[PDB]
Every structure is written in structure tokens, then in C-alpha cells.
Amino acid sequence: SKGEELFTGVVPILVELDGDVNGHKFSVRGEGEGDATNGKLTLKFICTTGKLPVPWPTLVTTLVQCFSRYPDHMKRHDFFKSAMPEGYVQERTISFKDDGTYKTRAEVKFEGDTLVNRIELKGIDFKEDGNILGHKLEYNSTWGSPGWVRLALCLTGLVLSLYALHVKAARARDRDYRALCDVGTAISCSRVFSSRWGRGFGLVEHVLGQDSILNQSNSIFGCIFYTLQLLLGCLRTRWASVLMLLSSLVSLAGSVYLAWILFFVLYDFCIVCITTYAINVSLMWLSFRKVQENSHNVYITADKQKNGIKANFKIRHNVEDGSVQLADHYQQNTPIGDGPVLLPDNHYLSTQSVLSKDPNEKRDHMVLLEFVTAAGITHHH
Ligand SMILES: O=C1c2ccccc2C(=O)C1c1ccccc1
């Protein structure tokens, strides 16, 4: 692969898109540099026709995977580089969920010493009021809407915790108290909250002492927790997502311990408790999803009958009301010229993107930094 020998060092990249979406025609141009040795791209794109009719984040993937870092156990699998300098044809079908579709065809090749990506894109079936043409996606804000589902979960969790607080304080003060969540003799609410295990989870007093600041009614940790999850769900930084996930894992372990008490130790059926548990599971799942948005995995499999590759993956774009927009990608790559090519075993490219804005750019632009490194190929016994 003399091709891969083309990508030591820092190559100049040019990119040119001509696109038509639901009839609105537009042209994008981008210039930058590529470092296949660190898998790092830096690029600035400007729309040359005026107002871009779609959101910038939906054109990132259409807008040079030959700049990926292929590690040493994987050199025999880098198709993109091994097609150079003749280049390759990359074809994508990008389906947006409950919305339209992009069809793209690009040629990627060396022109002089410049890696050139030339794209024709055609989008159909878009709703002019949907997420795409309505410009309802997020670009890169620090703060954002928590979304309706996160809000339902956290407010319900908080209200239930404040109720359990009130209920604890009342059986403390009258042993004969019953609350709405006490029902006959099957479903119990008060004997649970006022047991050993309803303060500091029944653990603090043995580990830190009864005086501890941490020997609180469980519902105090509850209130703290649901408040936190709301707040962080309003943040869009990577560390916000890390905290969310780790606090959720704590909540999950606490739920399993408390349920092991509820059954098996106290023998009560507490509906408020089980609801708390379901909420914490939902939050944990959303925690997983939030955290997995920092890196996208492009799944590359070989396509021998066409002498190239095919690719599969999903993008989730943050929508301004707190939701997420799915973008299914199907991809084909076929060499332009001849000569041997490298047909890889199944593997993937791990991709991470950072969008930003030149404060000095009057035109409709996108500054894009990108890190891509390959993984997947199993190792040598
Ligand atoms: O899950 C819970 C549990 C299980 C066994 C023994 C005690 C308890 C609680 O304190 C209770 C709880 C506390 C606050 C909000 C919701 C639920």
C-alpha cells in the first residue's frame, strides 16, 4: 500500500458539496488539513450560496475516512488509504426518523497534492416544519432543555421522595399513622420508611456513626438525586454525562439493595418503592445513551463482489426541545481506479466530532475538529 504512504504527515484537504434538499439548492465549500497519523482532521466549511437550508450537524458525515488512524494490528485492513491516489466513490443513504432522506454520491481522490472530496447530495421527502428544514437541531450549546421524558421522571421522583419524607416524619410522631400508600395489609408504606433501613439506608449508623451528616432519611438522598439528574440533563458537556451515569449506577445499586430488603427481609409490598426503582432504571438507561454520544462507531464490512466496502451506523442529533433525532446511515465504497485494494475484516472506526463557530466569520459556517481511530480486529493468540 503505497497509498497509505501518501498519508504520513499532514495533507491539505479540499471539500466541495452541491446539494438539493426538497428543492432548495445550495453549495458548501470546506478547506483544512488532515493528519492520518493521529487520526485528526481540522476543517472550516462555509456555505457559498448564503443561508444553508439544513442544520450543519446533518452534513458532518457527508462532508474523508482515509484520515483515520489504523493501528498496527490493523494495517492490512485500511481500504480507504489503499485505494489512493485514484481514490474511491462513497455513496450514502441517510434516513432521518419520521422525516426525509439524503442520498449522496462523492468522489474522493488526490488532485495534485490535495485530498479532494466532491459531493452531490439530494434530499427528498422532508417536512418543511420538521427538525431538519425547521432548523430545530442543536449545534453546540453549553446549556439545553432537559426534555419531557427526563422531566417526567425527575419530578415524579422528587414528589415521591418528598411524600416519603412527610410520611416518615408522621409515623415518627404517631405510631398509628397511615398514609395514602398504606392500603389494607398487603401494600405497606410506613413500616418500610420508619424501619432501620429508611435512614442512611441502614448502613450509615454502623459505618460513620449516628451523628453523621450522612445519616439522613433515604428520601433526602432521593431529593438530592432527582434534582441533580434534572440539572445535569440540562448540561451538554461530557463530564455532565459522566456524573449522570455514575450517580445513576449508585441509584441502581441502592434500588437493588432496597428491593432485597423490601422483599426477603421486611416482606412488604411497597408501591411507592417499586415506582422509585423503575424510575431509577429509566434514568440509568438514559444515562447510558447520553454517555454514548461522545463517540460514534462506524461498522465496516467488506464487499468483495464490488471490490470495496460497506458501512453501517446511526447518529443521534440533539433536538432543541430535549429530544433526539435518529439518522440511519448506509454506506458503500468502491475504488475509482484499479490496482490491488485492501479488503478488511469486520471492524469499526471510532469517531468524535467537535463543532464550533469562528467569531470572526460573517458567512454561514462550521468549524469542525475530528478524531477518528480504528478498532475491532481481534488480536493474536
Ligand atoms: O425504597 C425504599 C425502601 C425499601 C426498603 C426499606 C426502606 C425503604 C425506603 O426508605 C423506601 C423509599 C424511600 C424514599 C423514597 C422512595 C422509597
**Closest to 246 (Cα-Cα) out of 278, 307, 287:** 287
CB atoms within 10 A of CB 261: 21
Q: Is 234 annotated as a binding residue?
A: no
**Contact in structure between 201 and 310 (CB atoms under 8 Å):** no
d(CA 142, CA 318): 12
- In this structure, what CATH number is given to the domain that contains residue 226? 1.20.1440.130
- Size of the chain, expressed as the number of residues it contains: 381
Residue 130 class from Cβ within 10 Å (0-12 exposed, 13-18 middle, 19+ buried)?
middle
- Is the CB of residue 189 below 6 angstroms from any atom belonging to ligand 1? no
d(CA 314, CA 272): 37
CB-side neighbour CA atoms (13 Å) of 311: 23
What approach was used to elucidate this structure? X-ray
Residue 234 sits in which domain range? 149-293
Q: Which grid cell is 256?
A: 437493588
Kindly give the residue spans of alpha helices, DSSP state H, lying in the chain.
2-5, 79-82, 148-171, 190-193, 204-207, 218-233, 238-261, 271-291
**Contact in structure between 26 and 53 (CB atoms under 8 Å):** yes
Cα-to-centroid distance, 75 and ligand 1 (Å): 55
Give the angle subtended at the CA of 245 by the CAs of 241 and 247, to the nearest 5°.
115
Q: Which grid cell is 323?
A: 429530544
Q: Which grid cell is 276?
A: 422509585
Residue environment code for 219-239, b if the CB has 16+ CB neighbours within 10 A, otherwise e: bbbbbebbeebbebbbbbeee
Distances (CA, A) of 265 to 36, 196, 258, 260: 59, 11, 10, 7
**Contact in structure between 300 and 348 (CB atoms under 8 Å):** yes
Quick check: helix, strand or coil at residue 147? coil
**Closest to 372 (Cα-Cα) out of 83, 6, 30, 42:** 42
CB atoms within 10 A of CB 185: 8
- Is the CB of residue 96 below 6 angstroms from any atom belonging to ligand 1? no
Ramachandran sector of residue 209 (left: φ over 0; alpha: ψ -120 to 50; beta: rest): left
Cα-to-centroid distance, 182 and ligand 1 (Å): 13
d(CA 156, CA 164): 12
**Contact in structure between 195 and 249 (CB atoms under 8 Å):** no
**Contact in structure between 82 and 3 (CB atoms under 8 Å):** yes
**What backbone torsions phi and psi does residue 374 show, to the nearest 5 degrees?**
-85, 150
d(CA 116, CA 129): 34
d(CA 314, CA 289): 13
